[PDB]
Every structure is written in structure tokens, then in C-alpha cells.
């Protein structure tokens, strides 16, 4: 036979290998691909989907819809903070979003994130609000003016339902690690730019729902078996 000689890396199985292989079932033929709707080629189209943050991750809301929602208080003359979050894609709560899980299935990420926000309160009601981002190396802001020094948007709550805005990609490195240990990507932070004003005898309350998705900018590397989910023992049947 041809004189051949064998390199190391022979005779192993690697779960992430790439090769031809022989057939168990020669002469077989598969069923034809009918034109089923809902084609897919990549994970990024899933990233492009807006999904809700369970923003309001606490005991009093977790076992319910309400952890996707925040409640606003039209009673308050103040500039102050409504909420804040990290921005690291596999941090809590963001990891629990589908982009979060897809990022949690991965080790590297890059590109800017889309964020979106609906004024879910009574149609008769008005406000304008500050949504802001904090470039890190610094504490999460404690005045509205701090957030005004960050990159931010002021929401003209017009007839249109939703404000949508982007955390710009400002990683030193072209990628960042998907889960921080002792590390940070920056903060989302939210504030009363005006007070919220309902007209008289409206419910003394309002709701806000918050969305995120990958921008056209977004991408991942180092697919890894995700942090997000655990199996204990045998899966019964």
C-alpha cells in the first residue's frame, strides 16, 4: 500500500471535530424538504427579536408577569431614579432574555444592543422620561444629572407607543467576555425627566415594559454549553 505515517491527534474522538464519515444506512433517501415557513440560518435572527427583560426581578413579582414590568408614581415631584440594570449580556436579569441565553451559550460578544420601552399607562396621560447608559470604570449614577452626562435619550411620549435606543459598543477590546466574573460592561439607568402627569381621577399609577435585542452591529464567538440551565441527575422519561 502507499507508504503512510501517522501524526498525533489520531484515534481520538473530539466532540467538536470536522470530517466525512461512512454511512450506517446506504441506499436510503430522506423525505423532501417541503416549503415549511419559518426558515433560519443563524442565531443572529433570534438576536434581532425584541424580548422582554424580567426587569423587576424580586420576590414580590418573580412568580408572575410582573417581573417583566415596572410601576410609575404620578404623585411624585422628583427628578429621581426609576430603575437601573447592568449591560453585560449574560448578567442577571438580561441573561434570561433570549439574547441573554444565546449569549450565555457563548463566550465572546460584540456590537451595540437595542433597547425599547412602552408607556403602558392610560392613553390620556403624559410624561417625558430619561433613559441613559453609563460607560463603566465608574459607579452607577445617583443623580439624574449624572445620567445626563452619560449617553442618553429623553422620551417624547407622543402618540407613538415606544421609545427605542442603543447602548453604543464602547468595549476597549473588539469583543467582551459574555459573562463577567470580577468585571463590568456598564449600566442602564432610568429617571423622571419630567414628573409623570395623569389627568384627574385617572388611576394613580402607570406601567412600563422594557425590551432588548441585538442591533445589526451584534455578533458572538466561542459557543459554550450555557451557564443558564442545570440538569441534576438523570432526566426521567
Amino acid at each position: 500500500g502507499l507508504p503512510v505515517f501517522i501524526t498525533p491527534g489520531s484515534g481520538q474522538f473530539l466532540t467538536t471535530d470536522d470530517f466525512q464519515s461512512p454511512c450506517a444506512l446506504p441506499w436510503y433517501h430522506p423525505t423532501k424538504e417541503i416549503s415549511i415557513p419559518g426558515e433560519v440560518k443563524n442565531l443572529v435572527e433570534i438576536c434581532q427579536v425584541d424580548s422582554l427583560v424580567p426587569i423587576n426581578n424580586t420576590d414580590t413579582y418573580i412568580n408572575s408577569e410582573n417581573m417583566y414590568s415596572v410601576v410609575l408614581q404620578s404623585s411624585i415631584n422628583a427628578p429621581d431614579k426609576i430603575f437601573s440594570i447592568r449591560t453585560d449580556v449574560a448578567s442577571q436579569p438580561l441573561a434570561t432574555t433570549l439574547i441573554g441565553e444565546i449569549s450565555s451559550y457563548f463566550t465572546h460578544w460584540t456590537g451595540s444592543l437595542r433597547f425599547s420601552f412602552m408607556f403602558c399607562g392610560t392613553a390620556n396621560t403624559t410624561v417625558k422620561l430619561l433613559l441613559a447608559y453609563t460607560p463603566p470604570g465608574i459607579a452607577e449614577p445617583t443623580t439624574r444629572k449624572d445620567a445626563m452626562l452619560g449617553t442618553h435619550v429623553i422620551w417624547d411620549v407622543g402618540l407613538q407607543s415606544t421609545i427605542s435606543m442603543v447602548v453604543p459598543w464602547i468595549s476597549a477590546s473588539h469583543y467582551r467576555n459574555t459573562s463577567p466574573g470580577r468585571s463590568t460592561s456598564g449600566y442602564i439607568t432610568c429617571w423622571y425627566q419630567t414628573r409623570l402627569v395623569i389627568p384627574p381621577q385617572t388611576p394613580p399609577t402607570a406601567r412600563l415594559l422594557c425590551f432588548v435585542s441585538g442591533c445589526k452591529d451584534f455578533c458572538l464567538r466561542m459557543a459554550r454549553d450555557t451557564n443558564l440551565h442545570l440538569q441534576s441527575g438523570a432526566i426521567a422519561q
Binding site: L25, T31, K41, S164, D217, Q231, A236, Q237
Partner: protein, 269 residues
Amino acid sequence: LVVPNINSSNPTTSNSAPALDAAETGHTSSVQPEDVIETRYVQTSQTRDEMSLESFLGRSGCIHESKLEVTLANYNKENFTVWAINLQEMAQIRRKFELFTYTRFDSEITLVPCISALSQDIGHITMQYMYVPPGAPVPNSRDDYAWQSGTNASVFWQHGQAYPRFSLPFLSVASAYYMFYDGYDEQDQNYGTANTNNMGSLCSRIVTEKHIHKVHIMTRIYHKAKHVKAWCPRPPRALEYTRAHRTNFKIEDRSIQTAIVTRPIITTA
């Protein structure tokens, strides 16, 4: 397959503005990053190819665990196993596929046979596997005539041999495997995949005849889907698995501790 570059974006304001939308449409929100940042032009030039389906599905993982003991007292009877083929009882692989309505692929299948000694030696050992499509006569005995295999895909391993593998083409009577199903076999039991996903079973059996060494054989069985296609994505599993075919998740004497973790106040990151 790549992202575009990002252009420079001029600092401006105008009566035209796309930053507002109606998420209620169902359509994804105001799409563009250059809209609210006065960007410099950057060669955003990072490939999405690792994010491809022929990547993400197209890495192998373990599927099932064929543990056996070599019984002595009736070596000829007991020393074989059969397992109902499913992707539904190892979580990571399961969650790859528990991501869609349907998927289609050809399959690298890979066998990691292992012999564990309960005795001073193992000697030479040889082991059979068979794909048992449904309505093949299932082997009842380590001596069953069903170990003969004129047309069933049966394959052999022995001590010191390399890891066996084969390519299995896409099997289904339909276009794609049901990842989920919403009904029954026509007389109304086994709700969901336990209807549609009758692939039959894998089987294994010691081929060496009766011998003195008490041993366990364990095969870890692996697969990678390649030449993949997938159909309508669906949300990831939030909680521990429970019941293979069935989507059951409310475990006995337990509570629904999902992947979400709580914090003291929503104004603190």
C-alpha cells in the same frame, strides 16, 4: 456571512426621526444604531459564521448512557440492552433542539465504549450494537437470533479498537423531526412527541462468549447534527427537565426555581 461596516453618522436633529415605534406591531423596534450616536465610520467586520446552525447544532454532544453488567449465571440471556432513541434526556443537546418547532439534519453518531473491571483482568472483549428500527424483532436474549442482522445497521467494537462512528441520514417519514407536537396518535394518548418521534431504539450486546471476568460495559453515545435545517424558533427551556417526550416541569415535592435570580431593589444593579 458578515455584519456590514458602520458608517460615520452626522450629528443632527430633524422632524423626521425613527427612534420612536409601536412594539405592539410585533415587528422589532427602531433598528439603527447610527440614529442616536454620531458615530465614526468603523470596519465592523466580525463574522457570524460560528453563529451558523451548521455550527451551533453542528457540534457533537452526548445523548444517552448504555450501562450494562456482564451477568454470569445466565450470560446467554441477560447481557444486552435496548434504548428508545430520543434527544430528550441529556439537557444540553435537548436544549439545542428544544429551540424550534421542527429540525432536520444528518447525524454523525459516535460511540465511546468503556470497559470497567470488577475482576483482576478483562481479556479480549467484543461488543455489538444494532439500530432497531420499529418492527424489527427486538433481541430478547444475548443469544437471540436477532443478533444476526442481514439489513439492520449493526456494528462492532472490541477492546483496543478506536471509537466507532457512523453517518445516519435524516430519518423521518415527515420533512423534519417534530421537536414538539400538539395532539396524539389518533386514539388519543401519549400527547406530544411520544406520538410522532417513534424512531425505535438502539441496542447493544456482548459478542464474546461466556468468560470468567465480571465487568461493566458503559457506552457513552454522542451525536452531531450536520447538513442541518431548522423551523420556526421557540423559547429556551427555563427549568430542569423531567419526563423525556413530555414538557412537564412541575417536579414532585419541589418548586419552580427558574434561571432568573432576584435582587433587593430594582434601582440597584
